[PDB]
What we know:
- By secondary structure, the chain is an alpha/beta fold.
- The protein folds into 2 domains: 1-87, Up-down Bundle (Four Helix Bundle (Hemerythrin (Met), subunit A)); 88-305, P-loop containing nucleotide triphosphate hydrolases (Rossmann fold, 3-Layer(aba) Sandwich), CATH 3.40.50.
- The protein has helices at 2-5, 7-22, 29-41, 46-59, 66-82, 109-121, 137-147, 167-180, 197-212, 232-241, 263-271, 292-299, and strands at 97-102, 127-131, 155-158, 185-189, 221-227, 249-253, 275-279, 287-289.
- Strand 7 and strand 8 (287-289) form a beta hairpin.
- Helix 4 packs across helix 5 (66-82) and helix 8 runs parallel beside helix 9.
Amino acid sequence: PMEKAMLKSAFNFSKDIKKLSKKYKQADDEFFEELEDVLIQTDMGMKMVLKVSNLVRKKTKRDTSFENIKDALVESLYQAYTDNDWYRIDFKENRLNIFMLVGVNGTGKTTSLAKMANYYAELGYKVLIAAADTFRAGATQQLEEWIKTRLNNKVDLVKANKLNADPASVVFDAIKKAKEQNYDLLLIDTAGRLQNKTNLMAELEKMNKIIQQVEKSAPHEVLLVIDATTGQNGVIQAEEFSKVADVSGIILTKMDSTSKGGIGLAIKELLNIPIKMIGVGEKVDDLLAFDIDQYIVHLSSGFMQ
């Protein structure tokens, strides 16, 4: 799955690296200028280009073989990301885990939330979804579809029976069921528009108040969806959303459709929030726990043989 996910970005990165190898003589200043130009094209951003180049420069000598520069680069990419104050999904066996999914609409929340329910349901857990994006029953329609079409039998859905209902009332109904029938995970869908900031924050706080009566440390995760195909555009927008919600982690979707693999690093730099799950494709099971070494190794696969 990570191989298919990183196919397009790895092709682009290795295409540039292979070009770099052909006029490669020594790891000198002029070489670092050329390398920096390649790093720029991954769209990782200036600060990350600078951090990765400095790391490669630190690890290497002018006489380093081009093979050893590549090993250097792989290690420096991983280190650039892992250079932080921090990671894990707060899922415990002996409680009702509660995760919210957040972000601006049309980034892929309801798809991702469905994939997350399936991910835990396959691990043997009893999963409940709260369709609390009541802004259009379209999000509700989707959840219903996925439920009786693609999702494991251990995933159930609570929704609104009324038009444009208060989102907290769906959360009220879900928490009750989840607590009473020994569910292992409650996933909460939310609507999002920067425009409706005050209501969006108010609704999140209503939800929080409902759930913290059952689970004091809930929400255990608040997960923001970023569409990788949007590149740096999506990264900046995800930062703006991080002011509306106290985001604990990121779900990076559509990696497979993305040609610029610096985005993981762009996220780390701009948001400073861990990526925790990564979408590898369109099937219900195309969602993995994020692993930065795997992201880097598969991004690098085209030039590492």
